[PDB]
Design a protein around this motif. Structure first.
Motif, PDB file in Angstrom:
ATOM      1  N   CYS A   1      52.975  25.558  67.069  1.00 23.82           N
ATOM      2  CA  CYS A   1      52.974  25.304  65.636  1.00 23.82           C
ATOM      3  C   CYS A   1      54.314  25.686  65.008  1.00 23.82           C
ATOM      4  CB  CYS A   1      51.848  26.112  64.981  1.00 23.82           C
ATOM      5  SG  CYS A   1      51.670  25.920  63.180  1.00 23.82           S
ATOM      6  N   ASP A   2      54.781  24.874  64.067  1.00 21.00           N
ATOM      7  CA  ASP A   2      56.037  25.159  63.388  1.00 21.00           C
ATOM      8  C   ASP A   2      55.816  26.375  62.490  1.00 21.00           C
ATOM      9  OD1 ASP A   2      58.747  24.449  62.013  1.00 21.00           O
ATOM     10  OD2 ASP A   2      57.325  24.385  60.347  1.00 21.00           O
ATOM     11  N   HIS A   3      56.861  27.174  62.290  1.00 20.35           N
ATOM     12  CA  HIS A   3      56.768  28.347  61.424  1.00 20.35           C
ATOM     13  C   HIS A   3      56.995  27.806  60.016  1.00 20.35           C
ATOM     14  CE1 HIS A   3      57.770  32.038  59.333  1.00 20.35           C
ATOM     15  NE2 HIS A   3      57.429  32.741  60.397  1.00 20.35           N
ATOM     16  N   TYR A   4      56.022  27.019  59.561  1.00 25.27           N
ATOM     17  CA  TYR A   4      56.055  26.337  58.276  1.00 25.27           C
ATOM     18  C   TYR A   4      56.160  27.154  56.994  1.00 25.27           C
ATOM     19  CZ  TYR A   4      51.019  27.376  58.194  1.00 25.27           C
ATOM     20  OH  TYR A   4      49.782  27.977  58.190  1.00 25.27           O
ATOM     21  N   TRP A   5      56.081  28.474  57.099  1.00 26.46           N
ATOM     22  CA  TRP A   5      56.172  29.321  55.918  1.00 26.46           C
ATOM     23  C   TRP A   5      57.476  30.126  55.944  1.00 26.46           C
ATOM     24  CZ3 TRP A   5      53.228  30.229  60.193  1.00 26.46           C
ATOM     25  CH2 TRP A   5      53.384  31.467  60.839  1.00 26.46           C
ATOM     26  N   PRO A   6      57.804  30.824  54.840  1.00 20.71           N
ATOM     27  CA  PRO A   6      59.026  31.635  54.721  1.00 20.71           C
ATOM     28  C   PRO A   6      59.124  32.818  55.691  1.00 20.71           C
ATOM     29  CG  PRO A   6      58.251  30.988  52.573  1.00 20.71           C
ATOM     30  CD  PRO A   6      57.120  30.736  53.538  1.00 20.71           C
ATOM     31  N   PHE A   7      60.344  33.126  56.114  1.00 23.29           N
ATOM     32  CA  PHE A   7      60.577  34.241  57.027  1.00 23.29           C
ATOM     33  C   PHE A   7      60.746  35.534  56.245  1.00 23.29           C
ATOM     34  CE2 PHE A   7      61.945  30.624  59.607  1.00 23.29           C
ATOM     35  CZ  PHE A   7      61.307  30.911  60.806  1.00 23.29           C
ATOM     36  N   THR A   8      61.255  35.413  55.024  1.00 24.61           N
ATOM     37  CA  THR A   8      61.472  36.575  54.172  1.00 24.61           C
ATOM     38  C   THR A   8      60.693  36.449  52.865  1.00 24.61           C
ATOM     39  OG1 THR A   8      63.434  35.636  53.062  1.00 24.61           O
ATOM     40  CG2 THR A   8      63.800  36.830  55.116  1.00 24.61           C
ATOM     41  N   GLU A   9      61.123  37.210  51.867  1.00 18.65           N
ATOM     42  CA  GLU A   9      60.492  37.208  50.558  1.00 18.65           C
ATOM     43  C   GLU A   9      61.204  36.213  49.650  1.00 18.65           C
ATOM     44  OE1 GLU A   9      62.204  40.215  51.975  1.00 18.65           O
ATOM     45  OE2 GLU A   9      63.684  38.714  51.367  1.00 18.65           O
ATOM     46  N   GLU A  10      62.272  35.615  50.168  1.00 19.07           N
ATOM     47  CA  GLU A  10      63.046  34.629  49.419  1.00 19.07           C
ATOM     48  C   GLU A  10      62.271  33.322  49.281  1.00 19.07           C
ATOM     49  OE1 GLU A  10      66.392  35.163  48.136  1.00 19.07           O
ATOM     50  OE2 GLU A  10      65.579  37.177  48.507  1.00 19.07           O
ATOM     51  N   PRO A  11      62.059  32.860  48.040  1.00 17.08           N
ATOM     52  CA  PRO A  11      61.326  31.611  47.812  1.00 17.08           C
ATOM     53  C   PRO A  11      61.989  30.441  48.536  1.00 17.08           C
ATOM     54  CG  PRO A  11      61.419  32.874  45.812  1.00 17.08           C
ATOM     55  CD  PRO A  11      62.404  33.508  46.762  1.00 17.08           C
ATOM     56  N   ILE A  12      61.180  29.636  49.214  1.00 20.06           N
ATOM     57  CA  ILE A  12      61.689  28.477  49.936  1.00 20.06           C
ATOM     58  C   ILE A  12      61.066  27.209  49.357  1.00 20.06           C
ATOM     59  CG2 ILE A  12      61.772  27.256  52.132  1.00 20.06           C
ATOM     60  CD1 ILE A  12      63.529  29.742  52.022  1.00 20.06           C
ATOM     61  N   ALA A  13      61.898  26.194  49.162  1.00 24.06           N
ATOM     62  CA  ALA A  13      61.433  24.932  48.630  1.00 24.06           C
ATOM     63  C   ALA A  13      61.076  23.986  49.771  1.00 24.06           C
ATOM     64  CB  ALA A  13      62.506  24.307  47.755  1.00 24.06           C
ATOM     65  N   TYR A  14      59.834  23.518  49.759  1.00 24.61           N
ATOM     66  CA  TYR A  14      59.335  22.576  50.751  1.00 24.61           C
ATOM     67  C   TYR A  14      59.037  21.326  49.937  1.00 24.61           C
ATOM     68  CZ  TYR A  14      58.684  26.745  53.626  1.00 24.61           C
ATOM     69  OH  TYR A  14      58.903  27.910  54.322  1.00 24.61           O
ATOM     70  N   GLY A  15      59.984  20.398  49.907  1.00 21.01           N
ATOM     71  CA  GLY A  15      59.777  19.210  49.107  1.00 21.01           C
ATOM     72  C   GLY A  15      59.787  19.695  47.670  1.00 21.01           C
ATOM     73  N   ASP A  16      58.862  19.212  46.847  1.00 20.27           N
ATOM     74  CA  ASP A  16      58.805  19.634  45.444  1.00 20.27           C
ATOM     75  C   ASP A  16      57.969  20.893  45.249  1.00 20.27           C
ATOM     76  OD1 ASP A  16      60.218  17.256  44.537  1.00 20.27           O
ATOM     77  OD2 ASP A  16      58.325  16.187  44.852  1.00 20.27           O
ATOM     78  N   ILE A  17      57.560  21.523  46.343  1.00 22.52           N
ATOM     79  CA  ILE A  17      56.740  22.727  46.257  1.00 22.52           C
ATOM     80  C   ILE A  17      57.491  23.953  46.757  1.00 22.52           C
ATOM     81  CG2 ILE A  17      54.686  23.871  47.143  1.00 22.52           C
ATOM     82  CD1 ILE A  17      53.294  21.144  47.198  1.00 22.52           C
ATOM     83  N   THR A  18      57.528  24.995  45.930  1.00 22.52           N
ATOM     84  CA  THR A  18      58.212  26.235  46.293  1.00 22.52           C
ATOM     85  C   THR A  18      57.196  27.289  46.709  1.00 22.52           C
ATOM     86  OG1 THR A  18      60.050  25.825  44.764  1.00 22.52           O
ATOM     87  CG2 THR A  18      59.699  28.087  45.477  1.00 22.52           C
TER      88      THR A  18
END
Lengths: 282, 287
Positions: free
Chosen positions: B135-152
């Motif tokens: 499975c891809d590590h589809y979520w953030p590694f840190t506490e830094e907000p990550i933008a996935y398409g139009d969803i942060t």
């Protein structure tokens, strides 16, 4: 959540207990069924433009199981997919078409590829003569008609553009409106059910079932149809779990305690028939 | 069709009979279960343009129960994601069983999470197992907000333990924000069994959170059928045993397979479910 499987060997003692103290348990169970699906969304059915598409103001299809037609509210029709003994969308429980929705109804029949329609009441959305009638962009012509004492079967030829579809129409006419169903009423309906089932095992899309509201007789027909098949292959029946399930796909399925008790009446007869048959398994 | 309720009072005798002759009866039932759903169409999953969205060529979502992504005049096939609504103990679409997101579908996954308003995600696999991709590590590694398409997505917290990790995510699309609890069980090897006490506490943990949440519970592993199917069975059974005096594991597994193919992949996982119920039964007897 609501489920109470009973071994066929114990059904007699079971229904007797259900009937004691003035049908206390029949009533309690029905009171519990009334709580099913209260929190399931049915917003589409309440949209301003779709209100006139509902025969009864408070009998609305859930948004998740509603059949969608393929404008504002153009996808709407008061109908829901219902699980059956053989598939998760074996049936479509819908209300008797209104004059203002008969074209949508035929569109559903074609799009969903339904080759069997079961009408449990005596609105005349189908052709009166052999003359092909156009309901919107869909032409329907009655090919043949057979009439029995308690029911009638009509064969319809439906077309649209290059698409052509044959559809059997079974209208039960002896459904009791008043009084408690006699042993004969039960017998007749069970024969009708068995009859439709023989055609079912030879049809495409979901089986469309309707009565004026599409919940009472409709849910009763569906329950009996599923029960006959279940009782043939198994040694227990879970009527409560069954009606609860239908309630999760369409509200009010099996509209009255009367119908709920009747279903138990029919299962007892099914059990009697199974025992007296002594049929080995195929 | 396939159904066999068993009173809890004789589940022990039942289990022992099923285990007889090297799990003869268990296998008999599992072979019957492998036939469920073969005739259900999955046309959208077959489309060439959707091939890159399927982790495995043979694990495909049925059309009738697949989860549809919504979009405005978007491209062809944009509504597709390898996921299906599965009935639960409480509602018709209580769960969403899906595959472990791929790098190419991680944005579609978050879109599903937001649109379906899921507040709980249950991941039963590690991103990699035995050096093999799961499975891809589809979520953030840190506490830094990550933008996935139009969803942060922002990982508010990350609490790890021996057998699982709990992560609190805050996700938003412009002003549409949503809190999502992500429970990742790390001790369930693919195609296998936790190798009961551990997994049951996990299920109980997710169940507690569930009672406080709304929306469908997203469940996924690698393919989205084996461990995912076993977990759902366990979650549903825990609630069922709490309220009734019988269990129908056969009917339960058959039902899941009518909503998504291959739910509960192996005979071993199938037997593991029975073993778990036995444990659940005894715990209940302590009262």
């Amino acid at each position: 959540s609501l489920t109470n499987p009973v071994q066929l060997d114990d059904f007699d003692a079971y229904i007797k207990d259900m009937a004691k103290d003035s049908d206390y348990k029949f009533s309690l169970q029905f009171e519990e069924l009334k709580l099913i699906g209260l929190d399931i969304p049915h917003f589409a059915a309440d949209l301003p433009l779709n209100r006139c598409k509902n025969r009864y103001t408070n009998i609305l299809p859930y948004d998740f199981s509603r059949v969608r037609l393929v404008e504002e509210g153009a996808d709407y029709i008061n109908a829901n997919y219902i699980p059956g003994y053989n598939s998760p969308q074996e049936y479509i429980a819908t209300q008797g078409p209104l004059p203002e929705t008969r074209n949508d109804f035929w569109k559903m029949v074609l799009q969903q590829k339904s080759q069997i329609i079961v009408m449990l009441t005596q609105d005349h959305y189908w052709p009166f003569t052999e003359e092909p009638i156009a309901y919107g962009d869909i032409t329907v012509e009655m090919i043949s008609e057979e009439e029995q004492d308690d029911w009638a079967c009509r064969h319809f030829r439906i077309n649209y553009a290059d698409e052509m579809q044959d559809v059997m129409h079974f209208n039960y006419t002896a459904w009791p409106d008043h009084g408690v169903p006699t042993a004969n009423a039960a017998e007749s309906i069970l024969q009708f059910v068995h009859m439709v089932r023989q055609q079912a095992t030879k049809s495409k899309g979901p089986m469309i079932i309707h009565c004026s509201a599409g919940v009472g007789r409709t849910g009763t027909f569906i329950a009996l149809d599923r029960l006959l098949q279940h009782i043939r292959d198994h040694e227990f029946v879970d009527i409560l779990g069954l009606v609860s399930e239908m309630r999760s796909y369409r509200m009010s399925m099996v509209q009255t305690e009367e119908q709920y008790i009747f279903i138990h009446q029919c299962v007892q007869l099914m059990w009697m028939k199974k025992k007296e048959g002594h049929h080995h398994h195929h």
